XYZ file of C-alpha atoms in Angstrom:
115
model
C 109.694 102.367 24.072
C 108.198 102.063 20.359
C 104.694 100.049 21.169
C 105.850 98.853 24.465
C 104.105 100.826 27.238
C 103.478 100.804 31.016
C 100.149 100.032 32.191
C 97.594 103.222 32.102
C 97.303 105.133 35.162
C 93.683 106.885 35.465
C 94.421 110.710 35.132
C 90.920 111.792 34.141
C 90.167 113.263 38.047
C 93.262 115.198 38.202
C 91.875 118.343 36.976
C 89.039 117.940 39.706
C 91.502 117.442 42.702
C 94.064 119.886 41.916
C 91.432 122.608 42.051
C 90.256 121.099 45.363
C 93.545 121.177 46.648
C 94.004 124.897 45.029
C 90.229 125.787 47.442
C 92.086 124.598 50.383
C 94.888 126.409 50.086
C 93.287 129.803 48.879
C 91.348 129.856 52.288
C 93.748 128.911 54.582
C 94.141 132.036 57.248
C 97.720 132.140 56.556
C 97.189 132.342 52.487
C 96.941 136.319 52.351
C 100.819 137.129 51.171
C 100.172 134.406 48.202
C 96.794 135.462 47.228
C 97.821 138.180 44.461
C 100.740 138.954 42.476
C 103.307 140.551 44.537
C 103.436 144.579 43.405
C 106.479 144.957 41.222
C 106.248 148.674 41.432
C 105.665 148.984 45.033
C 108.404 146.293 46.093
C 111.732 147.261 45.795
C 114.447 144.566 44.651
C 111.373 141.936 43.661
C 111.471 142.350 39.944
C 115.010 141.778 39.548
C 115.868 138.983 42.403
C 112.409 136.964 41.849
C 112.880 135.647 38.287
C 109.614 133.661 37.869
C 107.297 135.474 40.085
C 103.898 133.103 41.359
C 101.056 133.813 43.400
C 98.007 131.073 44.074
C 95.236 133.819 41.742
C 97.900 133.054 38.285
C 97.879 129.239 39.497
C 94.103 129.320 39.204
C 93.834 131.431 36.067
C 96.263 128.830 34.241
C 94.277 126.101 35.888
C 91.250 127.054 34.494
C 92.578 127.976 31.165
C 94.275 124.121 30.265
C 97.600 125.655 30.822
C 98.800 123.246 33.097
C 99.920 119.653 30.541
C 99.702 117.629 33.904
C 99.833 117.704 37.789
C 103.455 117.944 37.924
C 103.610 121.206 36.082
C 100.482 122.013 38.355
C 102.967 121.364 41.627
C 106.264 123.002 40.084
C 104.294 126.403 40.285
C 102.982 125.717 43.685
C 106.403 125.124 44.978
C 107.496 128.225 42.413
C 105.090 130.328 44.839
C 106.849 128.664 48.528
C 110.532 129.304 47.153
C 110.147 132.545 45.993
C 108.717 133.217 49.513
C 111.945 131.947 50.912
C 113.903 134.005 48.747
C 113.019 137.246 50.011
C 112.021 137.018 53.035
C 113.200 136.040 56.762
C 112.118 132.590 58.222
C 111.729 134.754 61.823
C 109.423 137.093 59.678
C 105.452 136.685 59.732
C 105.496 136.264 55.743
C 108.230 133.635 56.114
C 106.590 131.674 58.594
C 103.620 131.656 56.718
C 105.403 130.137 53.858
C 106.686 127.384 55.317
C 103.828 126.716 57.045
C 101.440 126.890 53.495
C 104.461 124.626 51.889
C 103.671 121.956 54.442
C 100.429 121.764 54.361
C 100.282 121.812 50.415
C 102.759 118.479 50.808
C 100.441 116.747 53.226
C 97.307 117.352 50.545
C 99.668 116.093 47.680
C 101.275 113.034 49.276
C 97.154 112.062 50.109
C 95.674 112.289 47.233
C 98.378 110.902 44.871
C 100.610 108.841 46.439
């Protein structure tokens, strides 16, 4: 509260790891249905089911740009990109697979290097 405040927790390397993080997951051989913006012309039903669309290339543009406040808001749009992915497509699919499979290695990397 009001000058009473939890000791300080060194932040100054998060930057730095999330984009490491980010590198690992861009070249991961199963990263190629994340890589761009899903085609919102070419995609029937996507624009109006996804609401918040999210691909890894708008992660690293905002990443790069100071748009992310913290590394929470960094993993919110990670997961963004994983849920959407369930959302439209089958788990018995090769895109849904994919997903899940991306989603678990992302959690491994996170739990890591932060907790």
């Amino acid at each position: 509260s009001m000058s009473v405040k939890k000791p300080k927790r060194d932040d100054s390397k998060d930057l730095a790891l999330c984009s490491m993080i980010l590198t690992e997951m861009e070249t991961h051989e199963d990263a190629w249905p994340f890589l761009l913006p899903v085609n919102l012309k070419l995609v029937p039903g996507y624009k109006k089911v996804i609401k918040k669309p999210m691909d890894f290339s708008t992660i690293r543009e905002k990443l790069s740009s100071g748009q992310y406040p913290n590394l929470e808001t960094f993993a919110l749009d990670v997961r963004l990109v994983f849920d959407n992915c369930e959302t439209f497509n089958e788990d018995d699919s090769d895109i849904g697979r994919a997903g899940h499979n991306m989603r678990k290695y992302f959690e491994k990397k996170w739990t890591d290097t932060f907790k």
